[PDB]
Amino acid sequence: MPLTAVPEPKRRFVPSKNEAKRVMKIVRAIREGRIIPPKKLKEMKXXXXX
Amino acid sequence: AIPRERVIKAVNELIKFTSKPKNLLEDDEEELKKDLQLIVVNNKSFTGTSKSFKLKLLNVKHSFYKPWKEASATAVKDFKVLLILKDSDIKKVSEDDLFDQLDSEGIKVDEIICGKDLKTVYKAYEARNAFISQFSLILADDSIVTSLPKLMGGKAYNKVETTPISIRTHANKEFSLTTLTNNIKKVYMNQLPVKLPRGTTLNVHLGNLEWLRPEEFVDNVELISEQLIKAYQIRSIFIKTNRSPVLPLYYNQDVLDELE
C-alpha cells in the first residue's frame, strides 16, 4: 500500500481545465483578431510567395 | 424429402433424454452442453480438397439468435455482436447510425473494429483470445474476410462463433448504409452459419432445446436439410446432442455408389 491516504483529486479524471482556459484565451485573441488562424496564415503565405 | 414425423419423433426422444436428471453454485458448462442440438451430416468428399474457412449461411425459417439473446441476458456469457470494418468505413459509419436501424427490429451491435485495431491493439495472443472469447456474433466485410486469418488467429477459426462471417456493406461501387442495414438483418435472423471442414463429416450446430419450439426446430431442420440435399451428395444424417448418441433420420444409399 502507499504511505499517504491522500484523496484523489477531481482533475485527474476529467479533461484538463487549465488547457481549456488557455484555449479560451486564444479564442478571445482570435475574436479580437490579434491571432490569425493557421489556415488563413497558409492562405497568406501562398499569395505572398508569388 | 424427409419424413418430418420421424424428426418430431427424434426431437421428442431428445426432449425426454435431456429431461432425465456437494453441487456447484455456478452450473457446469457440460450441463449446458447436454441440452444442445447439433446436426451431423455424412456426405461424400465434403472437402473442396482445400481448407474452407468460409461459412455458408443457410436460409432458416426461424431465428435462434433472439432466444439466444433472451436466455443470454439470464446467462453468464452475454451475447455480443462484433463487426469488423474498413478504416474509411469506420470513419464514415457512426454507432447511433447503427443503433437507430437496429432498435427498429430490436437488436444491437456491440462493437465495431478496424483491421488496424486487430493488428496493433490485439496483436497479442492472450488479449486477442480474451477479446474474441467475449463475442458470439462476429461479422466482417467480405473484402476484409480474406485478409482476416493472419490477424484472427487459428484459435478463432477452431470454434463456430469465433470464426467470422462474411457480410457486405457494398452493393454499388461504394457502400451504402442501407446495404449493411438490411444485410445484418439477413445474416442475423434469416441465415445460420456453416463451417466447412474436411473428411466426410459435417457438424452443424443448431442450439439448446430450451430456446425454441420443437416443431419449429423440426421445420428449421427440414428446411436446412433440404438445402443441404440440394447442395451436396449426402451419405446420412445423424442429429444429436453432443452428450447424446446419434439419431439416424435420413440417408441415401446410392450416393456411395455414385462416388465411384
Partner: protein
C-alpha cells in the same frame, strides 16, 4: 399508543413524520413514560425493534428542555459495541438532530483521530461511540467538555461483554460523573457481570421491562465479488438478499450493479428510513429482486421467504447467525437456501459451524465460468471519479469492518492479501487506509 400523541417539540414531530413513524411498538411504548420520567432503566428487547429511536426521542427532549450551547456540554452519550450498529444508530439519529438545534458526532476506533479530536474540540451535544476508543478520547483529548453528563445509555451489554470491553467500561464509569447522569441500557439477555455494571450505572432504583444445511463457498478474496456477480446473473428472476457489513460497500455494490443494469435494491444505514421502507416494501411485493443490505439492517426487520440467503461479508454475531438460520428455516415453509462466502483463511469458522452441529454443504466453483468483467471494472474505476471514490469508500469501510471484528481467531488482517481485496473492489493498487495492522 402513537408517537404523535405524546408531548413533543414540533421539530421532533416533523422528524417522526418524515421517518414514517406514527405508531409505537409495545415494549417501547412501555419504556417511554419512564424515559420521560427521568428514571434509570435496563431493558430486554430484540435487536432492531426501533429501540434506538426509543431513547433518541427523550434524549432530544432533554436537550430541548436544557437548550444548552455546543460549547456548553455533551450530555447524551451512547455506548454501542459494533461500528456497524454505531453507524446505523448515527444515521437514524442524524435527521432527528437535524431538525433539532444541537450537535451529533461519532467516536469510533478506526476513524481518523485528528477528525474526532477536532470534533471534540468543537464539542458535540450527542455522542455515539464504541467502548474502546472512549478511553483514548477521555484520557487523551484535552479541553473536551466532559463534566456535564446529562445522561448515558448502553446497548447490548451482552455484546460488550462477549467482546470483552467491560473493564474498559468500568474505567469509563469511574471517569464518568454519576449525580447529573442517568443511565439507560438495552440488552436482550443478561448475565451477572452485565448486572454488576448495571448496579454501578443505574443511579435510582429502576423499573425494567422484560418482554439444516448451510452452503459455504470458499473463494479467493479477489474473485469473490465476481463470483457473486456471476451467481446473481445466473439466479436472476429469483429474489435474493445479500448480507454485508459496511453501508458504504452496500451503496457502492448497489450503484455498481445498477451500472451493470441488473435491478438491485440497496438497504443500509445511510439510506433514509422512509426510502429504506420503500425499498423493503418494493422487495417484498416485487418477489423477484436483488436486495443488498448489511447484517444488522437485515437483523432489524423480518425477512420474506427467500430463494437464497447469501452472506458476503463476515458476520456481526455468528451465534445470532446460527439462531437466525434456524428461525429462518422454522419460520419459512418455503425453502430458503443459506450460503456464506468464505476465504481460505476463514476455515476455522467452519469448525465453529461444526460447533453449531448443523449440517454443511460445500458449493463448488468452476474456473471456466468466470464473468471476466474485471478489466471493464478497472477501466470504469479509472474513468469515473464518483465510482472511484465510492469504490475506495467500500474498500475503506470493509477494512475498518475487519478491524472492528471480534473473532480474531476467525479473521486476522495479517492473513489477508489486500492486493486481491483491492482487485475485487477493482483497484490494481490497494489504496491507503490508516489501519493498525
Amino acid at each position: 399508543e402513537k408517537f404523535e400523541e405524546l408531548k413533543l417539540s414540533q421539530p421532533t414531530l416533523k422528524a417522526i413524520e418524515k421517518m414514517g413513524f406514527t405508531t409505537m411498538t409495545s415494549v417501547q411504548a412501555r419504556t417511554i413514560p419512564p424515559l420521560l420520567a427521568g428514571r434509570d432503566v435496563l431493558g430486554a428487547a430484540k435487536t432492531g425493534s426501533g429501540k434506538t429511536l426509543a431513547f433518541l426521542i427523550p434524549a432530544i427532549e432533554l436537550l430541548h428542555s436544557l437548550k444548552f450551547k455546543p460549547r456548553n456540554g455533551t450530555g447524551i452519550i451512547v455506548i454501542t459495541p459494533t461500528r456497524e450498529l454505531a453507524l446505523q444508530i448515527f444515521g437514524v439519529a442524524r435527521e432527528l438532530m437535524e431538525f433539532h438545534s444541537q450537535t451529533f458526532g461519532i467516536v469510533i476506533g478506526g476513524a481518523n483521530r485528528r477528525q474526532e479530536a477536532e470534533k471534540l474540540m468543537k464539542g458535540v451535544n450527542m455522542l455515539i461511540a464504541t467502548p474502546g476508543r472512549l478511553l483514548d478520547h477521555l484520557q487523551n483529548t484535552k479541553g473536551f467538555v466532559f463534566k456535564n453528563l446529562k445522561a448515558l445509555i448502553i446497548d447490548e451489554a451482552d455484546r460488550i461483554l462477549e467482546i470483552g470491553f467491560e473493564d474498559e467500561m468500568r474505567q469509563i464509569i469511574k471517569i464518568l460523573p454519576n449525580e447529573d447522569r442517568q443511565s439507560m441500557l438495552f440488552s436482550a439477555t443478561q448475565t451477572t457481570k452485565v448486572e454488576d455494571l448495571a448496579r454501578i450505572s443505574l443511579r435510582p432504583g429502576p423499573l425494567f421491562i422484560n418482554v439444516l444445511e448451510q452452503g459455504y463457498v470458499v473463494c479467493d478474496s479477489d474473485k469473490r465479488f465476481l463470483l457473486l456477480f456471476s451467481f446473481l446473473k445466473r439466479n436472476q428472476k429469483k429474489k435474493i438478499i445479500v448480507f454485508l457489513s459496511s453501508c458504504n460497500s452496500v451503496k457502492y455494490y448497489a450503484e455498481l450493479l445498477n451500472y451493470i443494469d441488473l435491478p438491485v435494491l440497496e438497504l443500509h444505514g445511510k439510506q433514509k428510513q422512509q426510502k429504506r421502507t420503500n425499498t423493503f416494501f418494493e422487495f417484498c411485493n416485487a418477489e423477484r429482486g436483488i436486495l443488498i443490505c448489511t447484517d444488522v439492517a437485515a437483523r432489524g426487520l423480518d425477512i420474506p421467504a427467500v430463494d437464497w440467503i447469501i452472506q458476503f461479508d463476515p458476520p456481526d454475531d455468528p451465534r445470532d447467525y446460527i439462531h437466525r438460520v434456524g428461525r429462518t428455516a422454522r419460520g419459512t415453509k418455503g425453502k430458503g437456501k443459506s450460503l456464506m462466502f468464505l476465504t481460505p483463511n476463514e476455515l476455522g469458522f467452519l469448525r465453529y459451524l461444526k460447533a453449531s452441529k448443523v449440517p454443511l454443504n460445500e458449493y463448488e466453483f468452476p474456473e471456466n465460468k468466470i464473468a471476466n468483467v474485471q478489466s471493464q471494472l478497472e477501466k470504469l474505476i479509472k474513468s469515473n471519479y464518483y465510482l472511484h471514490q465510492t469504490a475506495k469508500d467500500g474498500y475503506r469501510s470493509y477494512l475498518q469492518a475487519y478491524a472492528s471484528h471480534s473473532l480474531k481467531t476467525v479473521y486476522q488482517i495479517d492473513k489477508l492479501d489486500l492486493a486481491k481485496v483491492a482487485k475485487s473492489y477493482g483497484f490494481p493498487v490497494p489504496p491507503k487506509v490508516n489501519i493498525t495492522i
